[PDB]
Design a protein around this motif. Sequence first.
Motif, PDB file in Angstrom:
ATOM      1  N   UNK A 211       0.805  -1.228   0.000  1.00  0.00           N
ATOM      2  CA  UNK A 211       0.000   0.000   0.000  1.00  0.00           C
ATOM      3  C   UNK A 211       0.838   1.278   0.000  1.00  0.00           C
ATOM      4  N   UNK A 212       0.425   2.254  -0.826  1.00  0.00           N
ATOM      5  CA  UNK A 212       1.082   3.558  -0.978  1.00  0.00           C
ATOM      6  C   UNK A 212       1.056   4.384   0.296  1.00  0.00           C
ATOM      7  N   UNK A 213       2.021   5.280   0.421  1.00  0.00           N
ATOM      8  CA  UNK A 213       1.943   6.282   1.458  1.00  0.00           C
ATOM      9  C   UNK A 213       1.342   7.579   0.885  1.00  0.00           C
ATOM     10  N   UNK A 214       1.016   8.501   1.784  1.00  0.00           N
ATOM     11  CA  UNK A 214       0.236   9.677   1.398  1.00  0.00           C
ATOM     12  C   UNK A 214       0.868  10.646   0.381  1.00  0.00           C
ATOM     13  N   UNK A 215       2.199  10.854   0.446  1.00  0.00           N
ATOM     14  CA  UNK A 215       2.816  11.660  -0.615  1.00  0.00           C
ATOM     15  C   UNK A 215       2.484  11.146  -2.014  1.00  0.00           C
ATOM     16  N   UNK A 216       2.668   9.848  -2.201  1.00  0.00           N
ATOM     17  CA  UNK A 216       2.363   9.175  -3.462  1.00  0.00           C
ATOM     18  C   UNK A 216       0.862   9.290  -3.787  1.00  0.00           C
ATOM     19  N   UNK A 217       0.026   9.048  -2.773  1.00  0.00           N
ATOM     20  CA  UNK A 217      -1.429   9.195  -2.896  1.00  0.00           C
ATOM     21  C   UNK A 217      -1.826  10.612  -3.333  1.00  0.00           C
ATOM     22  N   UNK A 218      -1.153  11.594  -2.736  1.00  0.00           N
ATOM     23  CA  UNK A 218      -1.409  13.000  -3.015  1.00  0.00           C
ATOM     24  C   UNK A 218      -1.021  13.357  -4.423  1.00  0.00           C
ATOM     25  N   UNK A 219       0.229  13.048  -4.757  1.00  0.00           N
ATOM     26  CA  UNK A 219       0.769  13.242  -6.097  1.00  0.00           C
ATOM     27  C   UNK A 219      -0.196  12.666  -7.118  1.00  0.00           C
ATOM     28  N   UNK A 220      -0.678  11.468  -6.812  1.00  0.00           N
ATOM     29  CA  UNK A 220      -1.630  10.776  -7.657  1.00  0.00           C
ATOM     30  C   UNK A 220      -2.901  11.579  -7.856  1.00  0.00           C
ATOM     31  N   UNK A 221      -3.543  11.978  -6.760  1.00  0.00           N
ATOM     32  CA  UNK A 221      -4.809  12.697  -6.870  1.00  0.00           C
ATOM     33  C   UNK A 221      -4.648  14.058  -7.535  1.00  0.00           C
ATOM     34  N   UNK A 222      -3.558  14.743  -7.208  1.00  0.00           N
ATOM     35  CA  UNK A 222      -3.267  16.047  -7.806  1.00  0.00           C
ATOM     36  C   UNK A 222      -3.052  15.945  -9.316  1.00  0.00           C
ATOM     37  N   UNK A 223      -2.366  14.888  -9.740  1.00  0.00           N
ATOM     38  CA  UNK A 223      -2.135  14.627 -11.160  1.00  0.00           C
ATOM     39  C   UNK A 223      -3.427  14.228 -11.877  1.00  0.00           C
TER      40      UNK A 223
END
Lengths: 257, 257
Positions: A241-253
Motif C-alpha cells: 500500500x502507498x503512502x500519502x505523498x504518493x497518494x497525493x501526487x496521484x490525486x493532484x495529477x
Amino acid sequence: DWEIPDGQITVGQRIGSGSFGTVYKGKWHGDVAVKMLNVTAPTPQQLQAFKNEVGVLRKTRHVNILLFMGYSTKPQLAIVTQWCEGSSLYHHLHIIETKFEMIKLIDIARQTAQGMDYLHAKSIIHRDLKSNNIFLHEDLTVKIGDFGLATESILWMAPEVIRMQDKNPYSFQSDVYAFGIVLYELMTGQLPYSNINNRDQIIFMVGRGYLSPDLSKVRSNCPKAMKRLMAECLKKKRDERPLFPQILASIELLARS
Amino acid sequence: DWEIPDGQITVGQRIGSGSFGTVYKGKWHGDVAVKMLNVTAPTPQQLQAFKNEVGVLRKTRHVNILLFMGYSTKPQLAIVTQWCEGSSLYHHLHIIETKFEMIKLIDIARQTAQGMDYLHAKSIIHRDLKSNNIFLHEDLTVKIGDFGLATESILWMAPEVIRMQDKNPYSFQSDVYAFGIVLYELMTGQLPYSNINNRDQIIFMVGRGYLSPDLSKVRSNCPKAMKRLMAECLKKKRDERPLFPQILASIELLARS
Ligand SMILES: OCCn1cc(-c2ccc3c(c2)CC/C3=N\O)c(-c2ccncc2)n1
Ligand SMILES: OCCn1cc(-c2ccc3c(c2)CC/C3=N\O)c(-c2ccncc2)n1
Ligand SMILES: [Cl-]
C-alpha cells in the motif's frame, strides 16, 4: 499553555458521541465543538486517554485537521475545537444522500490526503479514520478530527488490524487502508459490504482475505486512475500500500482532467 | 516544537510586501502563505522581531486568526500560515468594489470582532489592524493576519497613537479604534479622508482633533446601531471606547434583525 479556566466555556446542545466522551455545541470566543466526559470520578485510564489526545492535538496546525482550541480539567475533562457547520462525510453520503459532483469528491479526497500526510510527517497515526470523523466545513473544507484513539469501527479497519496477530497492527498503511474505504464511500456513495447483514461475518472474512470491497460499484465518471488508487490503498497486504505523498501526487495529477 | 526542518518549504510567486518581511505563495503540506526576510544576514533587532512574532502566533488557535503552521530559520527567517484563497478585505472593498450585502458586511464585522476578542483575552494587542490584514477565505470566513507589530497604516491609527506623547500609546482601545475604521470601510465601501491627498496633513489633523471620518457617507441600509457602534469605537478619548465583548454583544443583537 492551552488550559481554559472554568466558567468561560458555555455548553449547549448535545450533538452526539466521540471517542472518549460526549459532543456538545458550545460557546468560547464563538461557536466551538466540545468533547466532554460526563463523569464525576475520572478514572486514571480516562485521564491518560485525555492527556494523550490533548498531547497529540497540540502538535497539529493545518486547515485539514479540526482546529484544537484548548482543554478543560474542571468541572469535567474537555476538549475544545472549532465548530464546523455542515456535517460529517458519513452524514452526507449515507444519511441525507447528498450528491456531490466528481470534482468536489476528488477535492474531498485530496484534502483528506493532505491532512493525513501532515499527520504522518509529524509521526502521528490516527487509527480511526472514517467518514464520521471527517467534517465537511461550510461544505468546502475538510477537517479530520477525533484523535482519541490516536498515537504518536469495522469497515475502515485493515485485515491486519482485525486479526490482531501482531503486537501493534497499526501503521501508516492501516490509515491508508481506511482512507481507501473513504474513497470507496466517495465514489460509490455507499457503505462497503452492503449485501451482507452480518457484522461478525464481515469481520471474519475481511480478516482472512475472503472479503474485499467491490470496486465495480463506483460511478461511471470515476476516473480509472482513481479506481487504481483505491485498489492500491485497499491491498490486503500492508507493504503493498502507498503512502500519502504518493497518494497525493496521484490525486493532484488526476485532478487536471 | 514548530521549527520546520530545512528544505521542505517550497517558495513560489511573490504576493506583496508584509510587515517586516515579504510574502510569497508556497507549498508545505498543501498551499501555504510564507512571510520571509528578503535579506541575507539579519540585524539582531530584525531577529527578535521574528522571535516575538512567532511567540505571539504560537499562542493563537482560533478560526478568525490566520493559522500559524510553523517557522524556519534556514535558509532564512520565515513564517508559515494557512493560505487564504480569497484576498484582503481591502482588495474587495476598494479595488474590485465587491458588492456585499449588509448581512455579510455585518458578518465580517462580527468575525473580525470575534478574532480581536480572542487576542485581547490572551493579552495580545495587534497594533496593525487594517482591511489588509483581514484575509477572506472562501469569502465567508475572516482571517486576521500580520502580527509583526503584535505585543503583549495611519488611517487605522488612533489619534493618541499618532501623537506618541504617552506611556503605552497602544492599548486594546487603539485596536478598537482601528476596528472602527474597518466598520467605516464596510459601511462606506471606502477609505476615510479620501478627499484629502496628503499623508502628512492627515497625520497632523487626526493628531490634533481637527479631522475625523465623515459618518454621513454610510449606506442608507446601515442600521442605526452599527453607525452608533462605529462612532463609539471611533471616539477620540480611548476610555470612552467599548471593548470587544461589548462590541460583539451589540453586533450579535442587531444581527437578529
Ligand atoms: O460525527 C458525529 C457528530 N459529531 C461529532 C463531532 C466531534 C467529534 C469529535 C470531536 C469534536 C466533535 C470536538 C473535539 C473532538 N475530538 O477531540 C462533531 C463536530 C465536529 C466539529 N464541529 C462540529 C461538530 N460532530
Ligand atoms: O495584505 C498584503 C498581501 N498579503 C499579505 C499576506 C500575508 C501577510 C502576513 C503574513 C502572511 C501572509 C503569512 C505570515 C504573515 N505574518 O506572520 C497575504 C495572504 C495571507 C494569507 N493567505 C494568502 C495571502 N496577502
Ligand atoms: Cl478554516
